[PDB]
Amino acid sequence: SAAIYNIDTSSESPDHYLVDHTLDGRVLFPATGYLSIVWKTLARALGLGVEQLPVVFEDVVLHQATILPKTGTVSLEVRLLEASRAFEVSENGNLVVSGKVYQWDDPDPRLFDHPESPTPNPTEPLFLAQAEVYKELRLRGYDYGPHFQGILEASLEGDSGRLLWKDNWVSFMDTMLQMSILGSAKHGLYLPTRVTAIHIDPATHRQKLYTLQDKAQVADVVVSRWLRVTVAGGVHISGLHTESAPRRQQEQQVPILEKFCFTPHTEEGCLSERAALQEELQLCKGLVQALQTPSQQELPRLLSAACRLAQVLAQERPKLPEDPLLSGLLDSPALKACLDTAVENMPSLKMKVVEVLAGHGHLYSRIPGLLSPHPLLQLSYTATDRHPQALEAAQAELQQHDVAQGQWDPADPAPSALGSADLLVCNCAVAALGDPASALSNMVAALREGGFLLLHTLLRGHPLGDIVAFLTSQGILSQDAWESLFSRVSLRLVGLKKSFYGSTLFLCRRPTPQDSPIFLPVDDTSFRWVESLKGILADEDSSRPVWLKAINCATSGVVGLVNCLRREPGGNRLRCVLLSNLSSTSHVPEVDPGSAELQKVLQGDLVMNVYRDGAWGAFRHFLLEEDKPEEPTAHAFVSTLTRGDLSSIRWVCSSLRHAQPTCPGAQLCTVYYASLNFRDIMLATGKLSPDAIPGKWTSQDSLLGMEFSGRDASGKRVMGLVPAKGLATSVLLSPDFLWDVPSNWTLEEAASVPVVYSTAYYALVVRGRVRPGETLLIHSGSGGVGQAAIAIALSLGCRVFTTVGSAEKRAYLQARFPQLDSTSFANSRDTSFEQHVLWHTGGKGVDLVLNSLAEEKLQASVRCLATHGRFLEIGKFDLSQNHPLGMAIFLKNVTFHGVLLDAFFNEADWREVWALVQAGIRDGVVRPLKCTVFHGAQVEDAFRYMAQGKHIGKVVVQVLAEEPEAVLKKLMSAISKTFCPAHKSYIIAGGLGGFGLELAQWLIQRGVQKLVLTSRSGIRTGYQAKQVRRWRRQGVQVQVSTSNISSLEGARGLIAEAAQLGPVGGVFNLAVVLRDGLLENQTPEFFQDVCKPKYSGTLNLDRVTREACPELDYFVVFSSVSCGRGNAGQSNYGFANSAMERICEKRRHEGLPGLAVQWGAIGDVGILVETMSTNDTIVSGTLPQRMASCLEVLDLFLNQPHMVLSSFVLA
Ligand SMILES: NC(=O)C1=CN([C@@H]2O[C@H](COP(=O)(O)OP(=O)(O)OC[C@H]3O[C@@H](n4cnc5c(N)ncnc54)[C@H](OP(=O)(O)O)[C@@H]3O)[C@@H](O)[C@H]2O)C=CC1
Ligand SMILES: NC(=O)C1=CN([C@@H]2O[C@H](COP(=O)(O)OP(=O)(O)OC[C@H]3O[C@@H](n4cnc5c(N)ncnc54)[C@H](OP(=O)(O)O)[C@@H]3O)[C@@H](O)[C@H]2O)C=CC1
């Protein structure tokens, strides 16, 4: 019968290693698992064991991938046709695997002999270790677990290595496949789809296994790309074909990205850039003036009702707090900054937050969402009101945020359950507090010592406040009255966020009795203050506050050090508070110590207190704008930001602007009209993998557009054929692929000729050899290639049979080509055309078939061939799927042509075809197609216009309108993309590290050709050597430098080496050393040697770039999120990061380039992952960000004006 295999990935299941075979986050059944189950079925059928049965698989095809569920079981049916020697593997009656399988009757041990390498005796002592091998594999999308990690050693090119034999036939062969795909230059996931022949002989496999010193038997694997053969032990795979597997967007982590910027404690004029708020305020003022003498919002409606005319106000009170003006600061960064300040001055991660009068406050829908990005914050929010029913309408909302409920009138003392709160939030803009003094006392008592009060209110004497008072005529209080009341209840104002229309967020703190503070200056360059800090923090009984001071050395990293010390066991409540004076300009005078400013700071007792350009405040995180930045550029292309989404189509800045290597053999042509082809939308809808297109293409560039029309460098009207990137504002092509647009033609019409007519001429004339008077069968005759072939054939006086799928297409073809008769047309949507042809050729058939159809239509087209018939395959589905073609049509002297006009871009002879097309232009044989023109801004519409298939002729995106002034005589808003000129040298300090190598690869893919990688010890690992070798082989001038940036002379020398290659355009500080440990373990030398790679190194890089790099474009430093928020155990790391950030802010303030990226945990590569953080484990509440996401985030960050940006992934 049929063998049933119940694949269960359970712990006690005998097949549990399969959970370790993870590809793009989904547990996929290995392609070798099917081979193993078929082998078991065959062994059962022939009565032998698996280890006693040498086997041969042939023409194995994998039709679909089986996803193993987390829980449950997948049933696989294996059916053997022994007489046919074939097998079949099905999931639920759906074909999964097909091929042939049979016993190896005469096993050949000589088949399992390692072929000689094409480049032998490499003399390379460096090989890829198992950790490096699987780091590289995981970078490509292969999350293989420990069971599927059998490659314990590999050569730098992947042609040879060692495979660990764990008595598993699935894992061993899967590691063979990993070895085959390791040396592949292709990028991304590549899953096996077809394997020509697998020969497995366990008899020689046992004898070819040798045990190492670890007593673990291994085999030697050799991959010959020349022979296309992988041999390991007794396994020999030949003809393995791997097809690209798109990476699922579900596995794509969504990272939270913030900007880390300075904000003063007192802010005024907030929300001024909001035009809607200004318009609403103007309308309210006009309504108030009319009463004394957008518009659909609650406040304008109430004002209009009052103008028309108590009852109305009572009815509209519930919707009053939701007004945009009354909630402007509630939906503003000021509230987020105040919340961050509150959670910053906290004993531990616990956050006890209580809201007063939540019925009209509506702070339950913003505060927990705003504090959600905090990774380790434990939030306890309680919504309280005098009347519980007022919260009923918000009940469901209170269920969404897990907010507790309670009853408490502000005029009465708080309940004991609500006492000792950490944060108290009120929104009394609409709600009435009653007696301000009694209430203020009530939640002064309710708040614990050191707690924070955040109240959003309206100020009397202001437009919004005056309007509210007039409408309502306890009540609206002025700022002076509010401050006096705060002083009455012993509240110290630490924050002030005032809008333009008067609404204000007051932040107050309850003072805590503290002894005389100890002032510790942490500005010493020798880092001798760390010993004093350890000594003062060595005691636990004393709780006297310790104020860190950084009056000198404005580029001090005290912020990161303090943030890291807060969550340490020593100093959580010992008040490790800082005082930094970071003046971004020398014009602003500094704040003298021992004066009233320090007294005010102590009175506020805010943990983060920085003086910047006259302002007193702190560095806070803010949510980054979700919109991708756009710039006006003359060079842009069309890209699908998310694969398969036609709505994601956008104009992205191209690499043709920053780098313009105008040299003979290439030409920068301005694109006026670019046509869309079938391949473009097979790319844009995800049906065709971008890597399937031949050519050296990176994983970032878009391949939309194979042809274009427009102007040239000299301004002549030209049209062109390109392998890719033709859908752009400008295109770089050789003149070998250029034709001159004739005067009678329009640039719009000419943008339809290149691809279709070149393909028709190559298939018909070059390969088909269409002699005049012959009989042709042209499929999709209404298409582009079809119309071109019809025109050529009618020029040659040929009988033509065009297959079209519509009556309108028939009519258009008849009108366009009057030489075609009613018998010239058949149906392309069914096999029927075959009979039609076989009827009108007298059963002889057609001489030439221009076939773009597939499957049964392809077979019918083959059956239409006459004797000496030429079959020109223009389509690719049956070619790509390796569909069998019956080799009996060749008995009719038939020649089968696989016509692909894509080898002309990576090989020649193309000129012949070129000449033909030019001839067709001269004779009038080449006639422009019908063009459906879409504007450049509507490109996506065009992409979804002909994908429906109703288009006739060609669809053309009008990138630029043709000027009628002459035939010989462009800024657009495009998404900013980071591209680097080839004439600039880019330095990556620490570029040989984990993040360094991947950043170098990303920069190289972005156009960097002169690269300088700085390492303290040069190349040591096989992975580093392999990456450097690949970069050098592909043309990048990567240079490994031992020069250390920690010394000024070392930085100068490094910049000199970079300038030797070319002008310095980018400096990337990724150097880092780890001296992590608790503060009592910390030593001054540890801080010195940690800050030297990062702080002193960045200072030296700053100085040298200022003095010797006038053309610098990128000055990027990679800090950690430990500085932004805090991580216990690494205080020196945080100090170095914060100092780097201050350096970058100083650089950016003066106009020079500067960027500090506060990375969270990095997943694919790094240092913490390689040592002991396998896969992506929750580290400090932040998940390890994947490298692809890291590179996209860096690309986004590099095109922003913000000095310091942070990115991490929530757990
Ligand atoms: N191998 C090579 O060198 C090259 C091959 N080509 C191939 O030529 C074939 C056709 O290309 P081309 O003629 O320019 O494409 P067109 O957009 O001009 O039209 C293709 C024809 O295919 C039919 N068709 C079937 N399904 C669709 C659909 N979903 N959308 C639009 N049309 C559809 C239509 O004819 P009807 O609907 O009446 O059946 C249409 O007229 C493609 O398979 C393409 O891969 C193109 C260039 C080079
Ligand atoms: N991966 C992560 O978890 C996180 C990383 N980052 C940032 O990522 C960047 C890269 O670190 P990462 O790739 O992760 O870890 P790595 O250990 O792999 O990279 C550190 C590299 O920097 C080298 N280096 C050390 N000192 C110097 C120096 N003075 N000059 C030049 N090179 C030096 C290191 O020493 P050597 O030459 O001996 O090899 C090592 O090569 C750092 O900025 C780091 O702060 C930020 C947050 C998290």
Side-chain angles (χ1 to χ4, degrees), residues 1-14 16-90 92-105 107-120 122 124-210 212 214 216-247 249 253-270 275-276 286 290 294 297 299-300 302-307 310 314 318 321 324-325 327-345 347-349 351-377 379-388 390-391 393-396 398 401 403-406 408-429 431-437 439-447 449-463 465 469 475 478-499 501-513 516-521 527 529-530 533-539 544-551 553-581 583-586 588-589 593-594 596 598 601-602 604 607-608 610-625 627 629-659 661 663-686 688-695 697-742 744-968 971-1032 1034-1059 1061-1171 1177-1179 1181-1205 1207-1211:
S1 38
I4 276 275
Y5 294 90
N6 291 296
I7 305 302
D8 189 7
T9 63
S10 100
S11 321
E12 81 286 347
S13 179
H16 181 57
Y17 62 98
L18 296 172
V19 78
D20 284 325
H21 182 268
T22 321
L23 307 173
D24 209 71
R26 323 184 301 158
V27 175
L28 287 184
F29 197 65
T32 76
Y34 302 115
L35 311 180
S36 183
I37 67 177
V38 172
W39 194 11
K40 294 203 220 118
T41 308
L42 190 62
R44 212 179 308 158
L46 325 180
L48 303 144
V50 160
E51 307 285 340
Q52 273 71 227
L53 173 87
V55 76
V56 181
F57 301 83
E58 294 214 71
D59 305 322
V60 166
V61 180
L62 287 105
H63 306 267
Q64 49 169 242
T66 315
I67 294 102
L68 310 177
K70 302 47 56 183
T71 189
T73 295
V74 156
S75 295
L76 288 174
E77 273 155 59
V78 177
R79 287 169 172 89
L80 302 183
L81 303 191
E82 292 206 341
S84 293
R85 273 173 152 192
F87 75 88
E88 177 198 84
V89 175
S90 322
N92 284 318
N94 285 290
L95 182 58
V96 177
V97 187
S98 69
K100 290 142 67 35
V101 65
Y102 50 94
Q103 173 172 24
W104 207 1
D105 279 301
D108 195 10
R110 307 280 83 75
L111 180 91
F112 310 107
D113 275 357
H114 313 273
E116 292 309 321
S117 185
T119 151
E124 187 53 67
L126 280 191
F127 51 84
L128 269 164
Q130 164 163 218
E132 334 181 27
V133 156
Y134 287 104
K135 153 168 66 185
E136 172 174 24
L137 281 182
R138 177 172 53 250
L139 271 157
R140 229 180 300 183
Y142 300 79
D143 321 304
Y144 290 121
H147 278 109
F148 277 79
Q149 280 168 6
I151 315 170
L152 59 95
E153 165 163 20
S155 40
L156 302 194
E157 61 276 1
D159 56 21
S160 59
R162 222 163 305 176
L163 291 196
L164 171 62
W165 171 253
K166 276 213 252 205
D167 223 314
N168 197 321
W169 282 105
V170 174
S171 94
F172 183 80
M173 305 203 222
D174 189 78
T175 51
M176 295 202 4
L177 301 188
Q178 300 161 15
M179 200 87 279
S180 317
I181 77 87
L182 193 57
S184 275
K186 309 102 208 193
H187 30 54
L189 219 32
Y190 265 73
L191 305 191
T193 53
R194 321 188 261 90
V195 194
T196 294
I198 303 128
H199 295 251
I200 319 174
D201 188 10
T204 87
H205 181 96
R206 294 182 218 104
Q207 75 170 42
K208 265 177 116 33
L209 284 172
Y210 60 98
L212 289 163
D214 314 20
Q217 27 194 15
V218 308
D220 274 331
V221 56
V222 46
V223 184
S224 193
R225 225 154 290 252
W226 281 10
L227 306 184
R228 191 38 262 162
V229 143
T230 314
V231 187
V235 187
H236 172 105
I237 285 163
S238 152
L240 161 82
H241 175 263
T242 50
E243 206 217 65
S244 192
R247 297 191 83 175
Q249 299 288 135
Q253 309 201 129
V254 47
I256 165 65
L257 327 177
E258 334 197 72
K259 54 145 177 284
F260 189 77
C261 46
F262 165 72
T263 37
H265 293 316
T266 293
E267 285 175 270
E268 299 190 25
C270 304
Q297 296 297 328
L299 194 57
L302 193 47
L303 275 166
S304 303
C307 263
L325 275 167
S327 70
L329 274 312
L330 304 192
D331 308 329
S332 89
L335 183 64
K336 158 107 182 126
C338 292
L339 288 176
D340 281 303
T341 305
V343 317
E344 165 197 299
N345 307 9
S348 85
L349 308 169
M351 206 34 33
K352 184 170 187 195
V353 182
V354 185
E355 176 172 0
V356 175
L357 296 184
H360 293 115
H362 288 8
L363 294 176
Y364 43 83
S365 71
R366 295 160 176 102
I367 298 175
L370 263 41
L371 300 181
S372 147
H374 285 251
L376 297 170
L377 187 65
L379 183 68
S380 305
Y381 200 104
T382 304
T384 70
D385 207 290
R386 34 171 75 101
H387 303 289
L391 300 175
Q395 202 94 328
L398 297 180
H401 299 303
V403 167
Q405 250 195 75
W408 170 38
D409 198 295
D412 307 314
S416 291
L418 304 179
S420 292
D422 288 296
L423 172 66
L424 197 278
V425 281
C426 180
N427 179 28
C428 67
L433 293 171
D435 183 51
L440 273 180
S441 180
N442 281 133
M443 62 319 293
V444 154
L447 269 169
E449 289 185 313
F452 283 87
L453 164 57
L454 191 47
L455 58 136
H456 182 258
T457 189
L458 317 179
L459 297 190
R460 186 159 287 224
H462 290 250
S478 73
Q479 181 178 352
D480 291 4
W482 276 115
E483 287 175 14
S484 184
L485 282 160
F486 297 154
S487 304
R488 185 194 304 273
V489 298
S490 295
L491 274 178
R492 197 104 286 172
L493 187 73
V494 302
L496 187 55
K497 318 297 175 182
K498 292 173 60 181
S499 79
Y501 50 93
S503 75
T504 303
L505 269 158
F506 284 105
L507 186 63
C508 299
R509 195 185 199 176
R510 189 181 173 166
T512 292
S516 59
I518 316 100
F519 293 165
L520 203 148
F527 287 76
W529 48 264
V530 71
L533 196 275
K534 208 165 49 167
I536 180 177
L537 263 156
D539 74 75
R544 36 200 290 96
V546 37
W547 246 230
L548 287 167
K549 315 218 316 172
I551 317 91
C553 194
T555 56
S556 81
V558 70
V559 175
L561 170 88
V562 156
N563 256 341
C564 291
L565 295 191
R566 285 299 311 285
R567 47 194 38 51
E568 250 191 343
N572 48 298
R573 280 329 287 130
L574 194 32
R575 295 309 287 166
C576 42
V577 175
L578 81 79
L579 203 293
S580 203
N581 298 135
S583 279
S584 280
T585 204
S586 268
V588 160
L598 176 157
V601 162
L602 265 300
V607 170
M608 236 54 81
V610 293
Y611 187 84
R612 173 152 297 188
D613 297 348
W616 264 112
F619 295 121
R620 316 250 55 99
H621 285 102
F622 288 132
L623 254 287
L624 202 60
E625 299 89 302
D627 69 89
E630 311 207 355
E631 62 190 77
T633 184
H635 308 259
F637 65 103
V638 159
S639 197
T640 52
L641 307 183
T642 93
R643 163 260 318 185
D645 201 356
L646 294 205
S647 84
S648 150
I649 290 191
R650 232 88 58 190
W651 290 96
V652 196
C653 270
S654 42
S655 83
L656 303 192
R657 175 259 300 286
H658 312 264
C663 83
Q667 221 155 18
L668 196 287
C669 294
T670 300
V671 176
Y672 279 54
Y673 295 86
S675 67
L676 312 186
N677 291 269
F678 193 63
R679 212 214 48 192
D680 296 340
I681 299 119
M682 308 318 273
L683 286 170
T685 61
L688 175 71
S689 33
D691 42 49
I693 295 183
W697 305 121
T698 85
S699 34
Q700 287 135 40
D701 39 44
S702 97
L703 313 177
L704 293 185
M706 275 163 330
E707 52 153 294
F708 83 101
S709 80
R711 257 70 195 287
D712 206 346
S714 56
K716 45 177 299 204
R717 291 190 333 159
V718 310
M719 86 210 171
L721 183 103
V722 300
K725 306 149 146 321
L727 187 53
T729 46
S730 56
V731 78
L732 199 73
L733 65 152
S734 179
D736 267 34
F737 299 88
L738 275 171
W739 299 266
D740 299 4
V741 178
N744 52 344
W745 287 10
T746 321
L747 267 175
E748 161 210 294
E749 335 183 342
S752 57
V753 173
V755 160
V756 314
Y757 278 102
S758 315
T759 321
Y761 272 116
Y762 178 50
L764 289 195
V765 193
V766 173
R767 292 197 87 174
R769 289 176 254 170
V770 181
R771 319 257 83 101
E774 255 161 351
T775 315
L776 286 118
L777 170 63
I778 288 149
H779 284 311
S780 309
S782 50
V785 172
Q787 276 183 50
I790 291 170
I792 286 160
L794 293 190
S795 72
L796 297 178
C798 283
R799 180 125 170 259
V800 181
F801 289 120
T802 85
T803 74
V804 281
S806 273
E808 225 45 54
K809 297 172 169 187
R810 251 176 171 101
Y812 175 76
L813 277 194
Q814 244 292 340
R816 163 154 269 233
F817 308 105
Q819 325 185 15
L820 294 171
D821 42 298
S822 308
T823 79
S824 301
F825 305 101
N827 212 332
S828 54
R829 303 297 228 254
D830 45 24
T831 289
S832 69
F833 67 85
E834 185 206 336
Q835 285 88 59
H836 174 98
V837 159
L838 287 170
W839 175 250
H840 280 98
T841 47
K844 269 126 46 170
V846 287
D847 284 299
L848 292 117
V849 177
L850 197 81
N851 177 66
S852 70
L853 312 181
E855 304 170 355
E856 75 288 330
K857 312 201 186 357
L858 171 138
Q859 300 294 330
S861 299
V862 170
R863 245 133 44 207
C864 288
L865 278 168
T867 317
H868 318 280
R870 280 92 82 208
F871 199 96
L872 326 161
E873 238 307 349
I874 309 297
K876 268 108 57 173
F877 179 77
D878 276 80
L879 311 187
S880 93
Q881 298 290 319
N882 198 48
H883 284 168
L885 164 80
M887 267 188 328
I889 189 79
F890 302 121
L891 279 176
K892 332 211 308 194
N893 239 32
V894 152
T895 141
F896 214 97
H897 294 257
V899 177
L900 324 170
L901 165 140
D902 311 307
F904 289 146
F905 316 111
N906 50 53
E907 175 260 328
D909 123 85
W910 150 256
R911 294 301 297 171
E912 168 177 17
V913 186
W914 185 97
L916 283 169
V917 180
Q918 192 75 237
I921 293 151
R922 299 185 305 87
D923 316 330
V925 172
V926 166
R927 207 202 332 191
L929 265 43
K930 166 154 199 251
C931 282
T932 311
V933 172
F934 287 85
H935 290 210
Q938 274 89 311
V939 39
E940 45 276 90
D941 306 358
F943 260 90
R944 64 174 71 260
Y945 168 74
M946 54 139 262
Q948 290 154 11
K950 66 172 138 133
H951 72 291
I952 214 75
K954 263 234 168 171
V955 46
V956 164
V957 179
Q958 170 179 312
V959 178
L960 193 34
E962 163 160 27
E963 309 91 3
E965 275 73 28
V967 297
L968 254 287
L971 280 291
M972 89 189 327
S973 266
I975 278 164
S976 278
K977 199 164 171 176
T978 286
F979 281 114
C980 308
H983 81 91
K984 268 182 195 225
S985 99
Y986 286 77
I987 323 167
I988 311 180
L992 279 196
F995 214 164
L997 281 191
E998 314 302 322
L999 167 64
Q1001 164 83 90
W1002 181 80
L1003 280 179
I1004 282 156
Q1005 288 169 353
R1006 286 320 185 80
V1008 168
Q1009 300 267 22
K1010 297 158 191 72
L1011 196 68
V1012 187
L1013 304 177
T1014 278
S1015 182
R1016 258 184 322 154
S1017 310
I1019 299 197
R1020 294 137 25 243
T1021 82
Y1023 181 70
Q1024 292 169 350
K1026 173 185 185 175
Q1027 295 303 321
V1028 172
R1029 190 151 322 158
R1030 282 201 312 102
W1031 298 331
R1032 293 216 188 97
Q1034 87 175 230
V1036 200
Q1037 303 179 37
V1038 311
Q1039 155 176 154
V1040 181
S1041 208
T1042 303
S1043 181
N1044 189 348
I1045 63 173
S1046 74
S1047 49
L1048 199 276
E1049 61 98 355
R1052 286 224 177 105
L1054 174 60
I1055 285 272
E1057 318 178 10
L1061 308 184
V1064 153
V1067 167
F1068 292 80
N1069 196 182
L1070 274 70
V1072 60
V1073 308
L1074 283 319
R1075 296 292 181 268
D1076 44 350
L1078 298 313
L1079 187 271
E1080 74 71 7
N1081 309 50
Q1082 283 292 355
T1083 60
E1085 55 261 55
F1086 281 8
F1087 268 65
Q1088 288 270 10
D1089 59 47
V1090 148
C1091 294
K1092 275 209 316 296
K1094 278 200 166 195
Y1095 180 25
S1096 86
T1098 309
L1099 266 182
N1100 298 330
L1101 281 170
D1102 189 331
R1103 277 254 285 104
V1104 182
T1105 40
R1106 295 255 269 264
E1107 90 202 357
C1109 292
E1111 261 74 347
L1112 182 94
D1113 291 320
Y1114 292 163
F1115 189 92
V1116 187
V1117 303
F1118 275 20
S1119 64
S1120 163
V1121 87
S1122 313
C1123 153
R1125 340 204 80 81
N1127 193 249
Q1130 41 211 15
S1131 32
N1132 36 21
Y1133 196 148
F1135 188 91
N1137 284 345
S1138 200
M1140 271 198 342
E1141 286 161 29
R1142 305 299 95 74
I1143 295 175
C1144 266
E1145 294 162 286
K1146 182 51 150 282
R1147 264 201 79 110
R1148 196 78 263 280
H1149 169 271
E1150 299 145 351
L1152 295 98
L1155 162 62
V1157 193
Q1158 291 183 173
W1159 288 109
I1162 320 286
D1164 294 341
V1165 310
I1167 177 161
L1168 44 57
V1169 152
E1170 279 55 29
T1171 60
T1177 65
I1178 290 90
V1179 181
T1182 61
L1183 220 61
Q1185 195 167 359
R1186 307 297 304 274
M1187 182 65 35
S1189 173
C1190 277
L1191 296 179
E1192 318 199 23
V1193 165
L1194 182 53
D1195 192 6
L1196 171 55
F1197 282 179
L1198 277 163
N1199 302 111
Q1200 307 253 330
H1202 302 326
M1203 299 121 294
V1204 185
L1205 294 97
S1207 154
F1208 49 100
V1209 175
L1210 257 290

